[PDB]
Amino acid sequence: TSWSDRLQNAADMPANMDKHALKKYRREAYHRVFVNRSLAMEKIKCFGFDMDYTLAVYKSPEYESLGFELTVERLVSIGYPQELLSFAYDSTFPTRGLVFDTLYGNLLKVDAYGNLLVCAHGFNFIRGPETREQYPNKFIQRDDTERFYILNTLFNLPETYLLACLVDFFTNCPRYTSCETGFKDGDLFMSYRSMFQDVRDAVDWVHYKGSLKEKTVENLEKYVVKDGKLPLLLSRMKEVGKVFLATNSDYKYTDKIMTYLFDFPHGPKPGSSHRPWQSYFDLILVDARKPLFFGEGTVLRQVDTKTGKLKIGTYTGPLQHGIVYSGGSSDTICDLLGAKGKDILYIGDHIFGDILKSKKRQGWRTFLVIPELAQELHVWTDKSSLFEELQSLDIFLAEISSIQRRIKKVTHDMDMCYGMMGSLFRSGSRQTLFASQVMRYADLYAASFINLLYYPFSYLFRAAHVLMPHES
């Protein structure tokens, strides 16, 4: 059972809007909205959405496998060895948020400070003492964005696995010679960095020039999760405020995926006339180029909706019924909807491009969707027993040569229940970079934005007051 299976099984459920059915439902973790900083829902005036992996959650592992296979075929078609075609995506390896070090070819799981929690070279886990030969302080500067790349989105799951496949392949194929920074084949040297760049470019190419979009819209039932409760949530939001779409996808793909997600024999609820997806939004904006969107942005353009091409020129007019925007910036939303940052709850899945940058640069309220959270919650309960005993052992310390070894074996035991790269949020007792950025920049987070449906729209999401150590 994948994470997307749990969300499609939640998606098949119709809405029981009885207000205790909601209060009871919302208190099971899978359907709850979690709170890092307090949020008075009644002060929200604009609900904004990303599309891919927010409104449109792709089915796992079918979608990752498709992108992986298309990416590999792209690499082979530009000259990588034919043996890449024998690769097959394996969803139990990659965890989101890992760092690829283009210098030494390692995937790293790090904490908020760049401390190494996990180091894997290909498929072989480098344990502490050996990691020191390349990381003397067991630490990286995770800001050095020219050496390190953070595989931060669900679109990066295929290349996360692929990079480990490549490193393992070249390491063991006897026509290559391993060097510290890459692989030699006679007079040709392939560094890990150029290898990394080919994979990145292949993934881009598959997405923008290859057949990935086509194969997806050809079989949306196989690749995209559909939920009849989405029209209902958006229509409730449209009563209490304004709803808008700001997505990086182009209009044609947006229209194809949005149309699918509203393809029901009803509208907001069973019995009601179906409505076009566009009618659910006071403002629709494609080609957003987030996170640039939250700084200077780009020129505001108008989509020719009959053709899917942009109209020539910059759009200077007012917000108009039926108009579809391309580009612009966060201030475009604020101007045309007459909103300020904290009137805006932006709902998305990219911790950098949607959440961090809108919080830091514009002061927007944030809702982060974590699709894996459905599964992560299932694992964290089922095996929390060994975490409390892990946690009890860190103070079992207090004032004993085996104690520092039972902690290491418990931590590894906890990690493997999630996959080979461990939990999205933890390695044992230590929070990941990702976990830290969620807490710091996501005002709210949930396995799915649909969990909002189970809360009244006056609700005050409250988090505990934070206290410094000396304040206790």
Q: Which of residues 282-301 bind Mg ion (CB under 5 A)?
A: none
Number of Cβ atoms within 10 Å of the Cβ of 256: 15
Q: Who contacts 205 (Cβ-Cβ below 8 Å, separation ≥6)?
A: 74
How many residues of this chain bind Mg ion (CB under 5 A)? 4
Non-local (6+) Cβ contacts of 389 within 8 A are 410
Q: Where does 264-387 show beta strands of DSSP type E?
A: 283-286, 300-304, 309-310, 324-327, 344-348, 365-369
Catalytic pick among 5, 12, 18, 50: 50
In the list 30, 34, 53, 148, the residue contacting Mg ion (rule: CB under 5 A) is 53
Question: Between 105 and 353, whose beta carbon lies closer to Mg ion?
Answer: 353
Q: Which stretch binds Mg ion (CB under 5 A): 45-53, 60-68, 267-275, 326-334?
A: 45-53
CA distance 107 to 324: 41
Q: How far is the CB of 426 from Mg ion (least distance, A)?
A: 23
**Do residues 321 and 335 touch, judged by C-beta distance below 8 A?**
no
Choose, by CB under 5 A, the member of 36, 41, 52, 193 that binds Mg ion. 52
For Mg ion, which is the closer residue by CB, 52 or 227? 52
Element (H, E) at 195: helix 192-208
By CB under 5 A, is residue 415 in contact with Mg ion?
A: no
Which of 25, 50, 411, 428 touches Mg ion by CB under 5 A? 50
346 binding Mg ion? (CB under 5 A): no
Asked if 111 touches Mg ion (CB under 5 A), the answer is no
The two tokens of residue 454 are 């189970």
To 5 degrees, how large is the angle CA 271–CA 273–CA 277?
A: 120
Q: Is 443 annotated as a binding residue?
A: no
User: Does residue 349 touch Mg ion according to CB under 5 A?
Assistant: yes
Structure tokens at 117: 């929690």
The residue (of 130 and 204) whose beta carbon lies closer to Mg ion is 204
Verify whether residue 50 is a known catalytic residue. yes
Annotated catalytic residue 282: no
DSSP class of residue 175?
T
- Report whether 360 belongs to an annotated binding site: yes
372 near Mg ion, judged by CB under 5 A: no
> Which residue lies nearer to Mg ion by CB, 288 or 453?
288
Torsion, Cα 406 408 411 413, to 10 degrees, reads: -70
In the complex, the residues that contact Mg ion under the rule CB under 5 A are 50, 52-53, 349
| Binding annotation for IMP | 50, 52, 200, 204, 213, 247-249, 290
| Binding annotation for ATP | 142, 152, 437, 440
Query: Which residues are known catalytic residues?
Result: 50, 52
